[PDB]
């Protein structure tokens, strides 16, 4: 039964269901949705000293 | 006096075409 499930890709499917699908963090989606800008006096400060 | 204003207007136009301590025009 285990061998049958794996060959039918049912095992891989189940893992994807509970690991990635049932996820709150789309990795390639969290990097595609991380917009912003702003500045940083930090770098400019080094030139002041 | 009229030409003196033309020569100057051409000089300020050269100071315009971009690149003493008269504070007024200095700032």
């Amino acid at each position: 039964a285990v061998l049958k499930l794996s060959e039918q890709g049912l095992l891989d499917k189940l893992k994807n269901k509970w690991w990635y699908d049932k996820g709150e963090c789309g990795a390639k989606d969290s990097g595609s949705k991380e917009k912003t800008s702003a500045l940083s006096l930090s770098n400019v400060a080094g030139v002041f000293y | 006096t009229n030409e003196f204003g033309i020569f100057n207007s051409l000089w300020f136009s050269l100071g315009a075409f971009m690149q003493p301590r008269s504070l007024s025009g200095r700032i």
Binding site: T36, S40, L41, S42, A45, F48 | -
Partner: protein, 91 residues
């Protein structure tokens, strides 16, 4: 600077004013750095995307230090000029 503004002093003619002037400037410079250094540090504090308005309030004292320091600097500058003039007169 007080001794250098005529007296009763100094007895360090001018020279003193130049020294006093630099000290005020340095004092102001130190103040500017301390305020800025302290200031730079708080702003960075990433926390972390929907703050800074928002987030905290900041200075505050900074403002005063931002103004006080500036004032000090100005004073120093004034002192320096005074000394310069004194020097000029002597010459």
């Amino acid at each position: 600077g007080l001794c250098i503004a005529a007296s009763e002093f100094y007895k360090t003619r001018h020279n003193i004013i130049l020294s006093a002037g630099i000290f005020f400037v340095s004092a102001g410079l130190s103040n500017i750095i301390g305020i800025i250094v302290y200031i730079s540090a708080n702003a960075g504090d990433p926390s972390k995307s929907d703050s800074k308005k928002n987030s905290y309030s900041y200075g505050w004292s900074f403002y005063f230090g931002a103004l006080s320091f500036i004032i000090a600097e100005m004073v120093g500058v004034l002192a320096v000029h005074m000394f310069i003039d004194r020097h000029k007169q002597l010459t």
